[PDB]
Design a protein around this ligand. Sequence first.
Ligand SMILES: CCCCCCCC/C=C/CCCCCCCC(=O)OC[C@H](O)CO
Length: 476
Amino acid sequence: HGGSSELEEVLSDSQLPYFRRLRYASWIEFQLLYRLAAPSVAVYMINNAMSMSTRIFSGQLGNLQLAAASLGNQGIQLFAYGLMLGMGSAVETLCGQAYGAHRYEMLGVYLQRATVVLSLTGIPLAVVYLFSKNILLALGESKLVASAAAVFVYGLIPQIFAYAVNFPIQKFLQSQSIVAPSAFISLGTLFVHILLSWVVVYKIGLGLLGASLVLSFSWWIIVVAQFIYILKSERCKATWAGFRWEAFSGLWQFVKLSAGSAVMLCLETWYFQILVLLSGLLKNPEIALASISVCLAVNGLMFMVAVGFNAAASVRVSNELGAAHPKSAAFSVFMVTFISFLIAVVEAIIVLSLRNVISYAFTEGEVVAKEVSSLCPYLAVTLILNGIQPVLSGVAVGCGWQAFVAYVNVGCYYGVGIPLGCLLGFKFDFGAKGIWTGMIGGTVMQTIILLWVTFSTDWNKEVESARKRLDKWENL
Ligand SMILES: CCCCCCCC/C=C/CCCCCCCC(=O)OC[C@H](O)CO
């Protein structure tokens, strides 16, 4: 329980040579990164598999049912997904810093205080789900498609409040460096999800409504399974003191800290969505929509590995800033960035080697395979950029820089990325290469700013700022 972190700090405090000290602080760091990032990827892959399993099981009832599962997941759910996870960012930085400062008693307070805030946030998301039929026909979709997706969206209204409890519990167990139980109950519920969705759809005949209800039901099985763990777990007897009335105090404070990360995700959900819509306005958008969707799907599939390093870099900096280990935090930021950078290099190598094959996997098109292969050099740059940007955003969450990063991300995306992509794409007639270059240029500037800031960071002041943050939340 934080003993390894103390040892790493002790190792840096020695007269031993730099190379001997580097090898033997990297080994203890690499062991901590692996014990955190490996189950984090396994959790997101199994959970997204349920979103794919529900999309697959519901899509086998007709082409209208598949469009309902696709438009419901990417249209309104992806908007509701980024809003719930954004508020769960303040409980991520508060639990990790408190777990490092041995204030285990208030870890359960942050869980409930995040649940109350997220449960109130899921109320505006509920009325949007009810009128999902009206917003789809407003975008021009057919009434039969809008009513079909709404019924599928009607079944996802319990998935909203399931997020409001799963995300605080996820970051709660993440701070204590215990993410293994979450990966195994998700594996079991997936078998329960595939089995129950097969019984509800094929035998009960509830249609696409029951298909989305089984998804929302399975999401509530991992919520109950995660809560009954912390009640019986021995590593959670110091961190979960039980239900407390203090969770209702200082709700607006949790709103202000988490508001930065929430806007960063929903706008980015629209930012990529705007980049797709803008690609439809380019000259010859017939192939620009398919090629960009292939590269972004590869970018999205490669992004699933980056979120594991994001969770690891977040808890490491949080646990070290709370335990007053500034040199260990400056090393964890460096170590996560380097290992994730080498992974992004391997991701770019595989894409460049299979530049002609990856296009046929998503859609069989000969002219599409050429256009995708032409954008693979640009996609490889985005993959390398997506191997440093999320880990620098994860350490910024651990330091509480969520407001500073949100200003930079929105400014680099909407203020720099979008105008550069439209100027290169439309005015300069570079097509999809101009859009992707503008998206690259946006991510480049963001990473550069964060890199200079993070490496010029006074980690002594971040430790003091972590004490002030924990002390103020303890007073109220
Ligand atoms: C849909 C699910 C919703 C889930 C959440 C429902 C409750 C949210 C309400 C909280 C404030 C009102 C209730 C608490 C009123 C007393 C608060 C209190 O003790 O205030 C102390 C004061 O702030 C000095 O420290």
